[PDB]
Ligand binder design. Sequence first.
Ligand code: FES
Ligand SMILES: [Zn+2]
Length: 396
Amino acid sequence: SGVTPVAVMTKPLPCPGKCIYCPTFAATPQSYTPESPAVLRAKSCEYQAYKQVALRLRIIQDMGHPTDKVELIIMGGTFLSADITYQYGFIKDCYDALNGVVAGSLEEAKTINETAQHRCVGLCIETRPDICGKAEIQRMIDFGTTRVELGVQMLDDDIYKLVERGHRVSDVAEATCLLREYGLKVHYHWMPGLPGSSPEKDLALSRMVFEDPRFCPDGLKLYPTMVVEGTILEQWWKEGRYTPYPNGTMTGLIADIKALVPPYVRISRVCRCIRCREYEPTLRRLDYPASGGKEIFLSFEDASDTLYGLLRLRIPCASLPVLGQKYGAKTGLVRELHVGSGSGGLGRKLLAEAECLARDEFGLDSLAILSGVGAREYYRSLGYELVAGYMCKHLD
Ligand code: FES
Ligand SMILES: [Zn+2]
């Protein structure tokens, strides 16, 4: 059985930036997907974490789908900007709902979940590029975050974002670098058809985001921009300040964007990407520079180029995480290890390869893996041990 997503929304928060013109509540990506099951559910649950997760679990169980492996997805983009107590409480609430038991603290809920029935093998947080510094990242590690979706939308400072205030490309670069240096998965939100853009511009930037070492995310979450009633884009469309791409245009652009994605990239819509090769396989290696460090994409693929497993190995520019003296000053980061139905030992093979590369080719002391709490046991059975949120192992 595969991993089941559990997507929940945080409460409507005020705008992170002080501005008398800014809207009452911060703009979310879900403002333009108002008929999504999860956002309607969230509104009906008054945005309470526990209730949302419980409801979603019942729904999944009623569909006949598995719940042993779960990925938590925290939606909004402004969550990390809220009050700290609210953040820790919200996360704790989620784990409590997964566990079926209420714990004393967040750490107890996490430790309980390590062996619970509904394992949290991943935790994804949506955040804005400018709300993503060392402090926020450390909090995310406290939460047990495995993946971060950055609200990049489009990579040009002269293009209007869908959120208030917007952000700069530099912010995206910095946030991406920091996310990588802490061993997290990085996905970009990608909105083609934004005001002040063009299909050509969107295509060029799409090509650029996979060539520039400052960027190159692990995944793109494509949000095809479209005039949604009740939003500000509706007003701009009224005023003629904005005209959306025709269906054929947008579709063509999406196709062209899918046509240029590197092997190590996943594409999802709200094609030779990861998602599209899901399915004797052999081991493949693909190196590429990123954020001053090196990224190594290992995979298991057959002559049909169908994907069976992957591992993302980072050789970091610096050792930002603190793990004590036992694991040296130079450590590699396994930012992802994913394996399809069956296999399982393909994971063992990938990990062995990773350890060998880190020990021999790059002369690293240890390997650290930012695992989800429901996946920690897996790595414990491979010789890793929990240190400061990471699953670490000395290379010998
Ligand atoms: S309305 Fe506040 S920054 Fe634009
Ligand atoms: Zn795809």
